[PDB]
Amino acid sequence: SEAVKKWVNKIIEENIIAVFAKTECPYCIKAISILKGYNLNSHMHVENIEKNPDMANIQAYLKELTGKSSVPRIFINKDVVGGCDDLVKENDEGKLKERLQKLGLVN
């Protein structure tokens, strides 16, 4: 499906912070909470891809883009962050803040 790919692309391209998630997903909730703790709400979009008729197509495309089909899948300014654990590594090692600083999202 070109349609599914274009829809996913629009989510990633029209939101600086794009998170693909599913219902009742503890590591989705943790990742989203970390990002909101940086006061990123205004530039964040969370898409629940389980509440979607094309979940499998979306997951397969997310795997083409990132190497994994699992949620959460996290993009920052179209760059692949990855999953919650990737976000935690970046956060703890200062890479996340650096990322956000270059975008003007944190001082």
Enumerate binding residues for Hg ion (CB under 5 A).
Answer: 22-23, 45, 84-85, 88
Contact 30, 24 (CB under 8 A): no
Whole-number CA gyration radius for the chain: 13
The binding site for Mn(2+) consists of 24, 39, 45, 47
CA neighbor of 34 nearest in space, from 78, 83, 87: 87
Supply the minimum distance, in Å, between the C-beta of residue 31 and Hg ion: 7
Supply the minimum distance, in Å, between the C-beta of residue 12 and Hg ion: 11
Supply the minimum distance, in Å, between the C-beta of residue 41 and Hg ion: 11
